[PDB]
Write a structure and sequence with these properties.
The structure is a homodimer of 681-residue chains.
Chain A (H helix, E strand, L loop, with lengths): L5 E9 L6 H9 L6 E2 L2 H6 L4 H5 L3 E2 L1 E2 L17 H6 L2 H17 L10 E7 L3 H6 L1 H5 L3 H11 L3 H10 L5 E5 L4 H15 L4 E8 L8 E2 L27 E9 H7 L5 E10 L12 H15 L8 E3 L8 H13 L11 E4 L2 H4 L6 H15 L1 E2 L19 E3 L4 E2 L8 E7 L4 E8 L8 E7 L2 H17 L5 H10 L6 E7 L2 H10 L5 E4 L7 E3 L7 H10 L1 H14 L3 H6 L3 H17 L6 E2 L8 H9 L10 E3 L9 H14 L6 H4 L25
Helix pairs in contact in A: 1-15, 5-9, 12-13, 16-18, 19-20, 20-22
Bound molecules: potassium ion (2 copies).
One potassium ion binds next to loops of chain B.
Protein name (chains A, B): PKS
Organism (chains A, B): Streptomyces albus
GO molecular function, one term (chains A, B): phosphopantetheine binding
Amino acid sequence: VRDSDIAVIGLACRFPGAATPDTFWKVLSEGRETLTHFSDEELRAAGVAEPLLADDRYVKAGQVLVDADKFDAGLFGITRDEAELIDPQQRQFLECAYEALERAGYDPQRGEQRIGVYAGVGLNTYLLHNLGERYRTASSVDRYRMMITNDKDFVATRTAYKLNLCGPSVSTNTACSTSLVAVHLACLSLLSGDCTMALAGAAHIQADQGEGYLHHEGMIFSPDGHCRAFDAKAQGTVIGNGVGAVVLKRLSDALADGDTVHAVIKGTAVNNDGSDKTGYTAPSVQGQAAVVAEAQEIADVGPETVSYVEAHGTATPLGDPIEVAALNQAFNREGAALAPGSCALGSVKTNVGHLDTAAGMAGLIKTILMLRHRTLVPSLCFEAPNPEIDFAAGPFYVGTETKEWPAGPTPRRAGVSSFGIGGTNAHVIVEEPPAVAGPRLLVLSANTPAALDTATADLARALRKDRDLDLSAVAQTLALGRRVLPYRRALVATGVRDAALALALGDAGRVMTAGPADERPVVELVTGGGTPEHAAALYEEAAAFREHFDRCAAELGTPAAELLRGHGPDAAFAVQYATARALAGWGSTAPVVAADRTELPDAALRLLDGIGAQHTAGRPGVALLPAASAPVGTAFLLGLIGRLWTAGDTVDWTVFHQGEPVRRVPLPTYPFERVRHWAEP
Amino acid sequence: VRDSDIAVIGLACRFPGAATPDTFWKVLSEGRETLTHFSDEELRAAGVAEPLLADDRYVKAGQVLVDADKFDAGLFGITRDEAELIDPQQRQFLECAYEALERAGYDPQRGEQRIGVYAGVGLNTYLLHNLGERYRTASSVDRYRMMITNDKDFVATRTAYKLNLCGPSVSTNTACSTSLVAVHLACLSLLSGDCTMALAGAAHIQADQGEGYLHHEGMIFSPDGHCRAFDAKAQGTVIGNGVGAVVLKRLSDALADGDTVHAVIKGTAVNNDGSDKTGYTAPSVQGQAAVVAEAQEIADVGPETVSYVEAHGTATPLGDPIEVAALNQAFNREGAALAPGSCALGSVKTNVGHLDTAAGMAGLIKTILMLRHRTLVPSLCFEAPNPEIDFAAGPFYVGTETKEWPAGPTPRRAGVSSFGIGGTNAHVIVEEPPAVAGPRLLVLSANTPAALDTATADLARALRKDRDLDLSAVAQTLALGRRVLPYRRALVATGVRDAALALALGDAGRVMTAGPADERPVVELVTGGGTPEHAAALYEEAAAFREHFDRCAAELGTPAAELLRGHGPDAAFAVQYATARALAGWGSTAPVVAADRTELPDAALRLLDGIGAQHTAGRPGVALLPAASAPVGTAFLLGLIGRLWTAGDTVDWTVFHQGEPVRRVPLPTYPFERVRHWAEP
Ligand SMILES: [K+]
Ligand SMILES: [K+]
C-alpha cells in the first residue's frame, strides 16, 4: 500500500440504458448498445421540423438519459420554482453524488470527515433554450436567480451546500476530458491534505435529447448512430447524455476505516497539447503519448504490466490511428515492442456514445467494474481492424468477448484515457482492489412514506440476492451511512435471510414503523418482578449495560451477582436503571418515567433523582423490561432502541458502534421521488 | 527559501481605471475611486429605457473596463468572424495572459518550461444577450462553433493553444472566489510537478457594462455606486469589470533562473461552508475563520507576523462584521487577543468595485504591489467604523493612508481573502520578495509596423524613466522573453540612456528596421586587408570567436597571434571565417558567399568547401568585416547579428546568452491593435 495510492470507495452513474452501477455492468458484460431509435411520431412530438425528418442525412437515433427531467426537490429542501430553474445537469449531478456517498457508506451530515468535490457540467442548453427568452425579458433580480441556478460555477458548490461537503468545492471544466481532470484534481487535493475524502464527477445532458441529429461530414458524429471504434468502417460517434461520480480516499485510510475498495488509482496525469498541431480542435499524437507515459511514471507502473486500456475511442478515421500510435509510443518508450496481442483495448463510447463532459466517468467506471469483477467485456461494433491503425507496432488488440480477466505477474492494471476539445489530455492508472454472531438492528429512513416502502423493498431484494453479506456490515452501513430522515422503520434480525423475509412481509410484530406524526416516547421504569435470565443475558452480552449495572449495584450496596439472580424490587430496578443509562450513553434523550417508587430503597430514590426521572408524562411509554414470554437479552435491548429511534428519539450511531470494527458495504441507494421539473420555453 | 514557497514572477491586469500594474499602483497609492458616472445621454445611447432612468432607485454609475471590446485577432491568428464570436472575457483573458508572461520574461513558444494554466470567467452574458437569438435560430454546425468560442471550458485551453502552454490547462469556477481558487490549484500543481510554471487568473466582463443598475434592498449592490467597506454607512458594493493574471514558479527555481520575484506565496487554503448556515447565499463566520487559520498553518506563518489583510470586503451591513469576527477568531486562536491596531485591513473593492470572478485578482495584485513597494495604501470611503464590527476584539484597523509599510521582526506578510457565493472560501498568504559592462543588442518585433513603432516608443520611454535598469537584463529579456514576430527592429547600445535616445530618434544610422518584405540576406566573405585591431578585439571579447579563430589558425598552419596581427589575405580570411562560424553557432542560416578565392591558400579553400560557401547569390550581402573607420570588435559583431536577424535570419538567443547569468525584468508589454470585435444582438 503506497502512500499515494487512492481508493475508490464508492461510485454512481446514470448513463443511457443504466441508472445504477449494477445495471451498467449488465450493459457492459452483456455487450449491449444502448442507442435509442426514434419513430417519426416521437420526433414530431418533440417538435422536429418536417424538412428535417425528410432529409436523408438526418439520423433518427440518440443516446438518451431517461428521467433526466426528474428531481426530488423536497429531499433537498428546494422549492418547485427553484427546481424548475436549476439546470437538469446540476440536479442530476446532485442526486448522483448523493448516491455515490450512499454507496460508499458515508453520511456527510455526521462525522468529522472533510469531503471535497470537483465536478463539471456541459454546455447549459437548458438556460439557452428553455430559459432563454425568460432571461432576456427578466429583471436583474430574476436574472440573478437564474445565474445562481444555471452557471457552471454552481454545480460543485450546490452539491457542497446540500450534502454538507466542507472540503474544496470547485467546478472544473476542460470539455471532453472534464471527468478525468476532476479525478486528477481530487487526487491532488487528497494527497496535499485539502481533504480526507473527495467526490469527482461530471454531468452532460442536452435539453433537447430525444431528437435525432443532422449528419455533417466535417464533424465527429456518425451517419447511423453507431460508434464503431477502431473498426475499418469507423465514421464517428453519437453524443450521449449522462452523469457519474466517484468517491475517493487514500487507500491506507480506506483500509484502516474498513471501507469497501472498488479499485485503486495508482496515478493520474494531465497536460495540454499546446500550439504544436494543425488546429484548436485537431488531435495530437505527442500530447496523448506524453500524458500516458506521465501517468505510468507517476503510478510507478511499467507499461508491460498494463493489460487493459480504456481508449478515448471516438471512432473517427483520423483519430483512431492517432490514439493507437500514441499508446504504442508511450508503451514502447523503454525499449522495443511489447508482445503483440498482450493488452486489450476498448471504448465504452461503443456502448453508450460520447458523454461529452461525462465521457471520462463512463470510461473510468466501466474500467472499475471490470477490475472489481476480474472480467473483460466487449468493445462493440468491431468486425475488422481499421487498416490505418498500426496494431502490429504494439501490444494492443480490440477485445470483443466477455471473459475472465487473466491473472498476471502483477495485480490487474488498466489505463483510462480522455482527450478534450481544446487539447487538455488526461490518463488515469487503475488497479484491481486488494483481497478482502448475534442479532442486529436494521434502520431505514426516507423523506416520504412511499420512499420508505420502496427503500424497504429494495433492501429486502438486495438481501435475498446476496446471502454472503454480513448482517453486521448491513446494520452499520445503514445506521452510519444513510441520511437521517423523518419517516422511519426498524427491524431486529438474526441474519440476512431472516431480515429479507421480515422486511418483505411488513408484519408489525417485528417491523417497526413510525413518522413525524407519532409522539416522542418516554421510557417507563415499572414495578414488576426481577428478570434474572434477561438480566444475565444483557450483563454478558452488552458492555454498556455491564458498566452501569456494576455501578448501580455499588450504589445499592448489593453484589452484582446477587442482583442478576434476584427477583425482588432491587433487582428489577437495577436492570431497568442500567438499561436507561446505556440508552442515555447511546444518545437517547427520551424521558425516564418512574411513576411508582414506594417499594424502592433510598439509594434507588437518589439514583432516580440524579437522572431526574419524571413522576409522570403528559406521551407513549416504552417499558424498560421485557414482557413475560417476550424476547430477552440483546434482542430486547435492540428492539427498545428501534422503537425509540423510529419514534424520533436521538441515537448516536457512532457511539453505538464504537466497540467494533465497522465495514461499509454497497447497499441500494435512495428512491428519489420522480417529480418532473421542467421549464417550458 | 522553503521548498513549498511559490514566487510570483510576473503579473498583469486590466481593471477599471487601470490597464497595467503600474497604472493600478497609481490608482491604489493615490487613493482613487475608479467609479464612472453616466450621463442620461450616455445611458440613452446605451438603450436604457426611459422609465428606468426616471426611477429614483436607479444608480447611474458603474465600474467599467475600457476597450473590453478590443482584440488583436491578427496577432493570435484568429479570423474576424471568429473574433466576433469569442466571449470578450476570453479575449481579454488571452491578451492579459500574454502580458503576464511578457512581464515575467518568458516566451512559451521557445524553451523547455512546462506551463500550466488555471483560469475562470464570469457568466457569459455575451452569449446570452449578443448571440442569444443567433444561437437559437442557427444550425448545429454554427451552434457548435458558438459553443467552443463561448463555453467556460474553453478559456484556459484557448489560452494554452494560442500561447503554447503544455501543462494542465483547466477552467476553474467558484463564483466570487474563482481567482484565489485558481491560484490555489496552480500552486498545488506546481508543488506536485504537473508543471514548472503556471498562470492563474480570471476575467469578468458584463456584455452590458456602460449601463447603470437598479437598486434592490435584497441584494449586495449599493444605492450610490460607492463601496464603503467597514464604514458605518456600509450599504453594499458595485459590480465591476476586469481581468487579471499572475505567473507562478517555485521560489527556489525562480531565484536559480534569475527571474524577478514580485512577491512570495507562502501558503493557500480552500474550503467550503457546507450546510451549516442559513442559506445557500448566506455568509459563514466558521467557514471563513477556518480557511484563514488553515492558510496560515500551511504557510507556517504565525498570525502575529501578518501586518496587512486584504479583506473580501464587500461593505454589506451583515457581511462586514462577520468577516472581521472570522479574522479575529482565526488570528486569536493560539491564545488571547493580539495587540490592537497592529494589522491593517483594507478592500480594493472600495477602489474598483466587486470584480466578481476576478475579485480575487484585484485583491491579490493590490497586495503584491503594496509588498513590492513596501507601501501601505488607503481603503476608501472609510469615515467611521461600523459600530457592529468588533475591532477591539482583535488586531485590525482600517488603514486610510499611503505610507511606508513599517519593517517588523519578520519579512512583511499579508493575507488575501476571497469568499464566493456558494460558500467556497479561499485565503492566500503573501510575503514581500527577498532582497536582490559592454555594448548590447536590443531586439524588438511586432506583428505590424504600427505596433513596432509603438513598442519602440514604449521601450524608449521605459528606458528614460529607470536609469538603474541593467542594459544586460533589458537585452536578455527582449531576446528571450518576447514573441518572435515579422516586423523587426534592432539597435546596438552602450547603455540605457544611449538606448533611450537612439530608440526615440529612429535614425537609421543606428536603428535597424526590416520586415517580411525585405530579402533574406547572405554574409559576404570579401577580399580586403586584414583588420588587426578588430581581430584582436573580437578575440579578446568574444569566446565563440576565439574558439573558431584558434581552430582556423590550426588549419592554416599559422599561430593565432601571428594572424591577429596580420594584414595579409590569410589574416583577413581567418577573421571572416571565424565570424561566420560564430554566427552559425548562434543559429544563423544565412549563406556564406565567397566570390573571390584566388589569393587564398589551399587550407582556406578546403575550409570554405567544408561550410559549403557559395560562389555567388541570386539577395543583399552583409560584409563579415567592418568598413574602414566603422565600429570594431563586439560592437561590429552585434550590429552584424542585428542586421541579419531583422532581415529574417535565424538566431538561437538561448545559445547566444549561454555564457552569462540571465536576469528577466519587467518591460513594457505588447501594444495590441485596438480592433473592435462585437456581435450586434
Ligand atoms: K497551431
Ligand atoms: K442550510
